[PDB]
Design a protein around this ligand. Structure first.
Ligand code: BEF
Ligand code: BEF
Ligand SMILES: [Mg+2]
Ligand SMILES: [Mg+2]
Lengths: 119, 119
C-alpha cells in the first residue's frame, strides 16, 4: 500500500536505507544513480521519494524540479551530505517536503518518511 | 492568504517569529501560554501551527495530542529546545509534521513553514 523510491549512489547506504524501509512493510525501489532515479521518479507512481543530492548524471536538484515541472507532486525527502542550512533552504524552497542531512539517525528518517505518507 | 498559529512562551522570540512570518505574507496569531494555545489550536482554523513544547498550563505534547484526538489535522511544526533526536521522533510519531529544535535558523523556519502549508 506504500511505494517508496530511493535514490542514493553509495550502494551499501542505499541498501541499508531500503532494508529499513522494507522492514516497515513498504514497497521499495532503489536506484544507485540519477539516471534511473529521474526515470523512476518521472514514470512510476510513488508515495514518497527519498532523494540524495550528489548523484551521477542527474543530481537530486534536477530530479526534484523535473518532477515538479511535470506535475508530479509526490512527497520528496532529501537525504544528503550537503548539510549546511543554506542547502536545506534551497531544497525546501525548490519543492522538497523535508530535508534530512547526513549523517542521519535511522529512527528519525523512518519517522519523517511516515510523517510524509500519512500527510 | 495563509493563517499561521504561534505558541511560544518566550515573548521576544514569539514576537520575533510573528514579525518574520507576516513579512513573508502570513496572517499570524501569537500565543504566549498553553492555555491560549490550546483553545486556538482546537477551535480556530489555521494552515500551519508552530508549537513550542514547554509552556505554562498546557505543554506542546498535550496540545498536539489533543489536536489529533479531536480530528484537527492541521499541519504542525514543533519548535522546541527539546532537541534530542528521541524527542524529535516522539513528536513526529505523535502526529507532528515537522520538528525543529532550538536554536534555529529563522530562514530554515519559514522555509519549512511554507513547505508544510504547501499541502
Ligand atoms: F551525495 Be548526496 F547529496 F549525499
Ligand atoms: F519551551 Be519549548 F519546549 F522550547
Ligand atoms: Mg551521493
Ligand atoms: Mg517554552
Amino acid at each position: 500500500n506504500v511505494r517508496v523510491l530511493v535514490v542514493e549512489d553509495e550502494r551499501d547506504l542505499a541498501d541499508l536505507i531500503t532494508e529499513a524501509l522494507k522492514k516497515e512493510m513498504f514497497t521499495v525501489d532503489v536506484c544507485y544513480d540519477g539516471e534511473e532515479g529521474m526515470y523512476m521518479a518521472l514514470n512510476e507512481p510513488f508515495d514518497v521519494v527519498i532523494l540524495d543530492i550528489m548523484l551521477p548524471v542527474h543530481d537530486g536538484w534536477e530530479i526534484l524540479k523535473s518532477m515538479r515541472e511535470s506535475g508530479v507532486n509526490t512527497p520528496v525527502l532529501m537525504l544528503t551530505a550537503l548539510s549546511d542550512v543554506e542547502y536545506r533552504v534551497k531544497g525546501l524552497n525548490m519543492g522538497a517536503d523535508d530535508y534530512l542531512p547526513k549523517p542521519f539517525d535511522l529512527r528519525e528518517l523512518i519517522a519523517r518518511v511516515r510523517a510524509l505518507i500519512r500527510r
